[PDB]
Specification:
monomer, Cytidine Deaminase, domain 2, two-stranded antiparallel sheet, 4 helices, 25% helix, binds zinc ion, AMSH-like protease sst2, hydrolase/transcription, helix-beta-helix sandwich
Length: 185
């Protein structure tokens, strides 16, 4: 039915995302959005038959401003995932006031995830704008740009096109399946 490919011609296995996830993530983190604070989550799941299914939304121990968010204890994130045999399939964070786009920070974070898993996706929610997006870096050219990048500075620019929206429903298909939310905060 569906074969998705990167810019470099490598095949991408399908990721099945619960349609409820986006909505549910906004629900659980709504208090921070109120206080104009970003929140991040991890999309976790399993590989069955050359396709990935997102089964858990994990909210890690974190810190945030209206501009940023970041994990503060990846050790217990690891232990949880290791204990329950859960793959890191991507991640999600909010833009309480902003438009829907991948920031410099997000691109640097996601680059590493996508190198470790070419299908890895970054979801960004913009509640205030009532828009959301599912993104990934161009592969190989965007990954290359961010890998070589050594600019200090949280909101610095990059030159050239670096990321793109994931094509749905080819790479990511939103379905009608279960979801556990694990809040580690
Ligand atoms: Zn950079």
């Amino acid at each position: 039915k569906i074969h998705a490919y990167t810019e470099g011609g490598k095949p991408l296995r399908t990721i099945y995302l619960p349609k409820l996830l986006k909505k549910v993530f906004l629900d659980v983190v709504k208090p921070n959005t109120k206080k104009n604070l970003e929140t991040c989550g991890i999309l976790c799941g399993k590989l069955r038959q050359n396709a990935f299914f997102i089964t858990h939304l994990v909210i890690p121990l974190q810190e945030a401003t209206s501009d940023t968010c970041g994990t503060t204890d990846e050790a217990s994130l690891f232990e949880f995932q290791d204990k329950h045999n859960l793959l890191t399939l991507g991640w999600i964070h909010t833009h309480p006031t902003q438009t829907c786009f991948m920031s410099s920070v997000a691109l640097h974070t996601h680059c590493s995830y996508q190198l470790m898993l070419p299908e890895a996706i970054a979801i960004v929610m913009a509640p205030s704008k009532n828009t959301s997006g599912i993104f990934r870096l161009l592969d190989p050219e965007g990954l290359q740009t961010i890998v070589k990048c050594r600019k200090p500075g949280l909101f610095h620019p990059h030159e050239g096109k670096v990321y793109t929206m994931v094509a749905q429903p080819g790479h990511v298909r939103e379905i009608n399946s279960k979801l556990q939310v694990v809040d580690l905060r």
